[PDB]
């Protein structure tokens, strides 16, 4: 009954069965393209967008990572700047994954419930008099919900095993909590950005880890650091957690 919903960077969405060693159930490509895009003409040294829209700057010659004064959305509030922001929802059957409806800003088509919403923010850079694009930055992310000073937490456990994502391996891994040794795994063709475990209605986001290595040692992430990943020659940043494995 349970599902493991995972959002890769190719824009696609897959479901895995955590009750059969992570067998793949179905795929879902909404056709909105990949999650990060960047066209360019002539230097501006390297602009690295994040999935929330925040852009970052790496200077090649001094080999340094800097922030950027504008985020993808701030360009929407030398060049004229076009584009737009988008949030489309996709309603899927809780089990089968058949699309029950897709509702966009454009319209609503129709054919428990898994609710998927894809955010997508694109910004092109157009020459003022020309009308030709000189660069662009398209960026998106997924988010999942189920439809039948204080901080919290939650762990992604299931049948005496816990499930975790290694973000540098793009792998969804399940470990027996007693012993910590690996139980099953699944690797994706495309880096993983977000993952959720759907169990008994409640949905769980699976934190993504970068294994600096069962006596497992997870840690936070500094002051204002950013984790670096690559999708088919395109770079981006996420929110992974540190993790070391010992014996």
């Amino acid at each position: 009954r349970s599902l493991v919903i995972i959002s890769t960077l190719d824009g696609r969405i897959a479901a895995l069965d955590p009750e059969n060693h992570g067998k793949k159930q179905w795929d879902l490509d909404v056709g909105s393209g990949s999650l990060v895009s960047s066209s360019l003409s002539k230097p501006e040294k390297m602009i690295i967008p994040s999935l929330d829209g925040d852009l970052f700057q790496w200077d090649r010659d001094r080999e340094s990572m800097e922030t950027v004064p504008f985020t993808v959305e701030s360009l929407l509030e030398d060049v004229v700047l076009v584009g737009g922001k988008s949030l489309t929802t996709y309603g899927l059957s809780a089990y089968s994954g058949k699309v029950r409806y897709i509702c966009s800003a454009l319209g609503c088509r129709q054919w428990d419930i898994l609710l998927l919403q894809r955010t997508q923010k694109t910004v092109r850079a157009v020459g003022p008099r020309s009308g030709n694009e000189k660069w662009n930055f398209s960026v998106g992310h997924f988010e999942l919900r189920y439809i039948p000073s204080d901080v919290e937490e939650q762990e992604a456990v299931m049948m005496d095993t816990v499930i975790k994502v290694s973000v540098a391996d793009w792998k969804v891994m399940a470990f027996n909590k007693k012993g910590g040794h690996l139980e099953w795994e699944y690797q994706f063709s495309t880096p993983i950005a977000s993952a959720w475990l759907v169990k008994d209605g409640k949905v769980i986001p699976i934190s993504l880890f970068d294994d600096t290595s069962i006596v497992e040692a997870a840690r936070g992430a500094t002051e204002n650091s950013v984790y670096l990943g690559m999708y088919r020659g395109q770079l981006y940043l996420q929110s992974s957690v540190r993790i070391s494995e010992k014996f």
């Binding site: 080999e63 340094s64 950013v226």
Partner: peptide
């Protein structure tokens, strides 16, 4: 640039 690590200024 670099590989698959965190970084900062």
């Amino acid at each position: 640039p670099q590989p698959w690590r965190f970084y900062a200024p």
